[PDB]
Design an enzyme around this catalytic site. Structure first.
Site, short mmCIF file in Angstrom:
data_model
loop_
_atom_site.label_atom_id
_atom_site.label_comp_id
_atom_site.label_asym_id
_atom_site.label_seq_id
_atom_site.Cartn_x
_atom_site.Cartn_y
_atom_site.Cartn_z
N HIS A 68 30.54 -10.45 56.24
CA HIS A 68 31.56 -10.11 57.20
C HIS A 68 30.98 -9.78 58.64
CE1 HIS A 68 33.84 -9.35 53.30
NE2 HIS A 68 34.84 -9.86 53.99
N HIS B 189 31.36 -15.50 60.19
CA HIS B 189 32.60 -15.61 59.47
C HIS B 189 33.79 -15.60 60.44
CE1 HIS B 189 35.78 -15.03 56.71
NE2 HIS B 189 35.98 -13.79 57.11
N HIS C 181 39.71 -10.77 63.66
CA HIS C 181 40.33 -10.37 62.39
C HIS C 181 39.50 -9.53 61.39
CE1 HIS C 181 38.25 -13.31 60.11
NE2 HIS C 181 38.84 -12.81 59.03
N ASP C 182 38.20 -9.51 61.51
CA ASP C 182 37.37 -8.66 60.64
C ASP C 182 36.39 -7.87 61.48
OD1 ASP C 182 38.01 -8.83 57.92
OD2 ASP C 182 36.67 -10.58 57.63
N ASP D 150 40.92 -17.93 56.40
CA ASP D 150 40.11 -16.88 55.86
C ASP D 150 39.66 -17.20 54.42
OD1 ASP D 150 40.59 -13.46 54.99
OD2 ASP D 150 38.93 -14.28 56.12
N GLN E 294 33.10 -17.95 41.01
CA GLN E 294 33.68 -18.85 42.06
C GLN E 294 34.78 -19.73 41.44
OE1 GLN E 294 33.61 -19.11 45.31
NE2 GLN E 294 32.40 -17.24 45.41
N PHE F 75 37.87 -17.76 41.29
CA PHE F 75 38.35 -17.60 42.67
C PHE F 75 39.14 -18.86 43.10
CE2 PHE F 75 36.90 -17.56 47.38
CZ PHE F 75 37.90 -16.74 47.78
C1 LIG Z 1 33.07 -17.83 48.98
O1 LIG Z 1 33.55 -16.75 48.15
C2 LIG Z 1 34.40 -15.76 48.65
C3 LIG Z 1 34.78 -15.67 50.01
C4 LIG Z 1 35.63 -14.67 50.47
C5 LIG Z 1 36.15 -13.70 49.60
C6 LIG Z 1 37.12 -12.59 50.04
C7 LIG Z 1 38.28 -12.85 49.19
N1 LIG Z 1 39.15 -13.07 48.45
C8 LIG Z 1 36.63 -11.19 49.72
C9 LIG Z 1 37.63 -10.12 50.16
C10 LIG Z 1 37.83 -10.13 51.66
C11 LIG Z 1 38.63 -8.90 52.09
O2 LIG Z 1 39.76 -8.68 51.57
O3 LIG Z 1 38.07 -8.11 52.94
C12 LIG Z 1 38.49 -11.46 51.98
C13 LIG Z 1 37.51 -12.57 51.53
C14 LIG Z 1 35.78 -13.80 48.25
C15 LIG Z 1 34.91 -14.80 47.78
O4 LIG Z 1 34.55 -14.89 46.46
C16 LIG Z 1 34.87 -13.75 45.61
C17 LIG Z 1 33.65 -13.00 45.13
C18 LIG Z 1 33.07 -13.99 44.14
C19 LIG Z 1 34.22 -14.82 43.65
C20 LIG Z 1 35.44 -14.26 44.32
MG LIG Z 2 39.36 -9.00 56.15
ZN LIG Z 3 37.94 -12.53 56.86
#
Ligand SMILES: COc1ccc([C@]2(C#N)CC[C@@H](C(=O)O)CC2)cc1OC1CCCC1
Ligand SMILES: [Mg+2]
Ligand SMILES: [Zn+2]
EC number: 3.1.4.53
Length: 323
Positions: free
Chosen positions: A72, A76, A112-113, A230, A281, A284
């Site tokens: 972050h 990003h 945004h972050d 995002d 992943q 996800f």
């Molecule tokens: C490339 O992999 C990822 C990229 C981004 C994210 C996030 C999500 N959802 C993590 C949480 C983040 C937040 O809410 O601050 C937003 C982005 C999560 C990711 O993977 C997560 C951790 C491992 C699998 C799920």
């Molecule tokens: Mg965020």
């Molecule tokens: Zn973000």
């Protein structure tokens, strides 16, 4: 230098490689790209934003993202702003957005972050952080990122909106708050449900361009667009996605460690001694990214079919890497 220019030829493309640009810009991906995006779009002429004033703001903003945070950081934010910039140009959304709205979306993506500490909203809440206390446990980080980005516009040297209308400044402020707040993952299902309802009643002018009647429908698409940007890492080329996956696991594992040191319950995906990076992943993509992108694709078809192909493909690479 010559490498930077070669890389920015891909500015309007999904295939842009943001790591390379950071390498060729003294580690200022976000300044680099915001400046490229704003010249590409003529945003500075259109809104009488001085060049110097914009650079100083962007530079200060980038400096407020933390470089010792694995994921972050400014890279990003630069990625989300660039992804967002491409999505605004998707054919299905052609003459739909005002210049102000376009400006608001890319600004939203940029800040945004900002000032993200490398830990989740849940962690800040459980440890009684000053931020959680300030924000009563509700979109903690997200409220914070907005607070910081809008704070930095206060000194006239950095008020890139000096020349907007009063009515224009307010409408932008309203739109940005709305978009950053929508990056809060706890609001994802609600947002995805609403996106599915908007697709259901989708309408077009006949040239395959969406009819989005006034503010409500327009900000809903922008909310989802920035949220899609995002959560766009797994839709990018595999070489990029793996570097992004690696950076997010470094951030999570550091949180798992900070959690362990303090006797707190460690959350499974932050546990370096048990979490499979690969299954992680795949879950996800199955439970979060594909359902969202599948719906985005429905809204703008067939503009995002390539992206769904890449996604379904990257999904399989990760699946094939687990026994
Ligand atoms: C490339 O992999 C990822 C990229 C981004 C994210 C996030 C999500 N959802 C993590 C949480 C983040 C937040 O809410 O601050 C937003 C982005 C999560 C990711 O993977 C997560 C951790 C491992 C699998 C799920
Ligand atoms: Mg965020
Ligand atoms: Zn973000």
């Amino acid at each position: 230098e010559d490498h930077l220019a070669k890389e920015l030829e891909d500015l309007n493309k999904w295939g842009l490689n943001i790591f390379n640009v950071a390498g060729y810009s003294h580690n200022r991906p976000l300044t680099c790209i915001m400046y490229a995006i704003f010249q590409e779009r003529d945003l500075l002429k259109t809104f009488r934003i001085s060049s110097d004033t914009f650079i100083t703001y962007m530079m200060t903003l980038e400096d407020h993202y933390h470089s010792d945070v694995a994921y972050h950081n400014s890279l990003h934010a630069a990625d989300v702003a660039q992804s967002t910039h491409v999505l605004l140009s998707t054919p299905a959304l052609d003459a739909v957005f005002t210049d102000l709205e376009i400006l608001a979306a890319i600004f939203a993506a940029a800040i945004h972050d900002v000032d993200h500490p490398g830990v989740s909203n849940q962690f800040l809440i459980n440890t009684n952080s000053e931020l959680a206390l300030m924000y009563n446990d509700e979109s903690v980080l997200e409220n914070h990122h907005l607070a910081v980005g809008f704070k930095l516009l206060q000194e006239e040297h950095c008020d890139i909106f000096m020349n907007l209308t009063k009515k224009q400044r307010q409408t932008l402020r309203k739109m940005v708050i709305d978009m950053v707040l929508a990056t809060d993952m706890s609001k994802h299902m609600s947002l995805l449900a609403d996106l599915k309802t908007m697709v259901e009643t989708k309408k077009v002018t006949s040239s395959g361009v969406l009819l989005l009647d006034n503010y409500t429908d327009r900000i809903q698409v922008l909310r989802n667009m920035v949220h899609c940007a995002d959560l766009s890492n797994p839709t990018k080329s595999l070489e990029l996605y793996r570097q992004w996956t690696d950076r997010i696991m470094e951030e999570f594992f550091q949180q798992g460690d900070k959690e362990r040191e303090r006797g707190m319950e460690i959350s499974p995906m932050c546990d370096k001694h048990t979490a499979s990076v690969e299954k992680s992943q795949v879950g996800f993509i199955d439970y979060i990214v594909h359902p969202l992108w599948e719906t985005w694709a429905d809204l703008v078809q067939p503009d995002a079919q390539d992206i769904l192909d890449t996604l379904e493909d990257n999904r399989n690479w990760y699946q094939s890497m687990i026994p």
